[PDB]
């Protein structure tokens, strides 16, 4: 997950075409990441080692 709540900030750049960019970021800044289950990954390591 990315907990920052990004928003779009749209500009018109060059004739008849539009650039998009990250806008003024709302809320408090937080750090993006991933999450995995420690018990099952360790068990899966335990099951892989025999192979």
């Amino acid at each position: 997950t990315r907990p920052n709540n990004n928003t779009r900030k749209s500009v018109r750049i060059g004739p008849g075409q539009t650039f998009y960019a990250t806008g003024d970021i709302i809320g408090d800044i937080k750090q993006a990441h991933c999450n995995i289950s420690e018990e099952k990954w360790n068990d899966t390591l335990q099951k892989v080692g025999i192979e």
Binding site: R12, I13, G14
Partner: protein, 52 residues
């Protein structure tokens, strides 16, 4: 806009001079940019100057 000692890898705010839809009315604009993506313009003391 930098949490000077944060355990964080935030994105940077800079600006730039934008050529509007008409090619001879230039105008400034700004937008954020994720931190790896931009290279400093110079390896010198040009701590202001930045480029994609």
């Amino acid at each position: 806009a930098t949490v000077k000692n944060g355990t964080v890898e935030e994105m940077k705010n800079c600006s730039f001079n934008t050529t509007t839809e008409i090619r001879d009315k230039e105008k400034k604009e700004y937008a954020l940019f994720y931190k790896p993506d931009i290279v400093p313009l110079s390896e010198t003391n040009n701590t202001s100057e930045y480029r994609l």
